[PDB]
């Protein structure tokens, strides 16, 4: 929490809101943060990174020749902090570190970075196959936080006294960041319904290529059924805490707008430019870039940005820049940061790539076009999930990511750290 840190916001600073050709990032890997292992069977995956007011919290799983978090036999939770070590750029220094108390039954977490102190919420479970063979009431759902000094603690939430604004068997937390607003926070949610309550006008306003034995009207219902278990539909929401000194538990359950649904996959909550900002990962036929302000918070609808140019590589039927309705599921998560609202320009680390994850691309972009994008590594580099946030240092806009990154084929795998800053100029 630094006077060089601020969070992005106020008036806007000078940088280019333009097209650029060859722009400078000053681009440069932060190498001391994530943890190394020896062992190269080991695989650290899905790494997630949340940063507000200074502080950083960081997660990775690391599982035993699985890159899947719920094969993970350990789960990492740092706590951080941004500096200024002087060489004029933004350092992460990493205050502690510690390992999930249940992380062998860890399913999913999320963190959110609130008050200068690291919060994680996980969704704990005996079954690996939970959100197919079951319901929340077998499962377990905890909080583990610290701060750096302290020692870290970890309290089970109440979701027996949870209230549901729709009948739910199932749910997980399932993103790369939530928010602390006020004394309540907000976490990225997936849920599992049984029945099929929903409405989807968006996807069934679609005149294209349409398969023949089946209507829009049911491939659209039937694009939101869990590829695992299909008589299941599963629905993004947002689980709302509000907590006294981490006591008296008030938890709340409530669905996504209706308005453009897309088949529940991870997204984020993050604080930004004075709003909050909705990221949800395509996972389904509508392949481009899914997210929006909120406008509403019950029930809760982001204002879905409408954006015909970042998208995501899949193998399958939807692959990069395919947007008809259709029964698919792939894709990866690659979140974004704003920089300008008035400009409406975003920062996001995308897979340059129709069908294949890899190729990172550090991209700057409007609704309509993208002004300007650099390579992040000239070699072809293999790379999964992409997490980026953004701030003021110095009065500079300033971004971190983290991409999930597989260099070596099946060798050690770990998830890797970059800074860069948005260019003065175009
Ligand atoms: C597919 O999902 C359904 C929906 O919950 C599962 O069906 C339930 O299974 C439990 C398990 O014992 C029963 O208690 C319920 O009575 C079932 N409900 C219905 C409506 O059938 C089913 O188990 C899932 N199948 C697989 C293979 O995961
Ligand atoms: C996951 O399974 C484990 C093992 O059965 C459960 O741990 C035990 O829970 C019982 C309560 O029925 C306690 O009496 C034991 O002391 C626990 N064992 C250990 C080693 O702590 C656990 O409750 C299950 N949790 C979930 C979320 O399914
Ligand atoms: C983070 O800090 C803020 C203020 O610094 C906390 O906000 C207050 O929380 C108490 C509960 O202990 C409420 O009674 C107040 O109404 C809140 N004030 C405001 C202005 O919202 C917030 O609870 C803190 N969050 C955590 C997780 O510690
Ligand atoms: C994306 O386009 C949709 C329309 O295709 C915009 O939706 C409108 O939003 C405004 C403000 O919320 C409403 O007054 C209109 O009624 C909406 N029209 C609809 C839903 O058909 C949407 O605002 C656009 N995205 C952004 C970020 O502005
Ligand atoms: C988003 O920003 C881009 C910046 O390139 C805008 O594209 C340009 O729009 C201006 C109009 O002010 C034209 O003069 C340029 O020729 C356009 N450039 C290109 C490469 O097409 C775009 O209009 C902006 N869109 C929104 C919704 O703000
Ligand atoms: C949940 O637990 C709290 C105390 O922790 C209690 O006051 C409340 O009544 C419980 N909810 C239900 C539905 O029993
Ligand atoms: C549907 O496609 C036709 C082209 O066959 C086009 O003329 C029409 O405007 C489209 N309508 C919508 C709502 O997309
Ligand atoms: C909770 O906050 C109060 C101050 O409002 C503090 O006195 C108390 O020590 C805190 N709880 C614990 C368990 O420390």
Request: proline share 5%.
């Amino acid at each position: 929490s630094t006077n060089a840190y601020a969070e992005l916001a106020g008036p806007p600073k000078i940088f280019c809101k333009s097209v650029s050709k060859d722009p400078d990032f000053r681009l440069k890997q932060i190498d001391y943060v994530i943890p190394v292992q020896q062992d190269r069977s080991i695989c650290m995956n899905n790494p997630l990174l949340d940063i507000s007011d200074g502080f950083f919290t960081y997660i990775h799983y690391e599982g035993i020749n699985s890159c899947k978090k719920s094969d993970s036999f350990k789960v990492l939770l740092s706590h951080g902090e941004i500096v200024d070590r002087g060489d004029y750029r933004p350092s992460l220094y990493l205050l502690s570190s510690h390992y999930h108390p249940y992380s062998m039954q860890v399913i999913n977490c999320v963190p959110v970075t609130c008050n200068q102190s690291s919060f994680v919420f996980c969704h704990i479970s005996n079954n690996t196959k939970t959100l197919d063979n079951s319901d929340y009431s077998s499962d377990e759902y905890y909080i583990t936080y610290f701060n750096g000094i302290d020692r870290p603690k970890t309290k089970k939430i109440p979701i027996n006294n949870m209230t549901a604004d729709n009948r739910y068997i199932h749910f997980t937390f399932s993103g790369g960041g939530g928010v602390c607003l006020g004394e309540e926070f907000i976490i990225p949610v997936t849920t599992v319904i049984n029945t099929d309550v929903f409405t989807h006008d968006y996807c069934e306003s679609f005149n294209c290529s349409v398969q023949t034995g089946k209507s829009l009207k049911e491939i659209c219902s039937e694009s939101l059924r869990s590829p695992t278990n299909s008589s299941r539909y599963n629905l993004n929401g947002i689980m709302i805490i509000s907590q006294n000194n981490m006591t008296d538990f008030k938890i709340q359950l409530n669905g996504i707008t209706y308005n453009k649904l897309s088949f529940g996959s991870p997204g984020r909550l993050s604080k930004t430019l004075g709003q909050v900002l909705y990221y949800q990962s395509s996972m389904s036929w509508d392949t481009y870039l899914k997210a929006g302000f909120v406008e509403k918070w019950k029930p809760f609808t982001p204002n879905w940005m409408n954006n015909t140019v970042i998208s995501r590589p899949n193998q399958g039927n939807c692959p990069r820049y395919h947007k008809c309705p259709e029964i698919c599921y792939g894709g990866t998560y690659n979140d974004i940061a704003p920089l300008d609202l008035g400009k409406d320009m975003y920062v996001s680390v995308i897979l340059d790539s129709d069908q294949l994850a890899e190729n990172p691309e550090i991209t700057v972009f409007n609704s309509t076009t993208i002004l300007y994008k650099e390579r992040v590594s000239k070699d072809e580099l293999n790379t999964r999930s992409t997490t980026t946030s953004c701030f003021l240092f110095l009065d500079e806009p300033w971004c971190i990511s983290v991409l999930e990154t597989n260099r070596f084929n099946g060798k050690s795998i770990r998830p890797e750290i970059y800074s860069y800053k948005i260019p003065k100029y175009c």
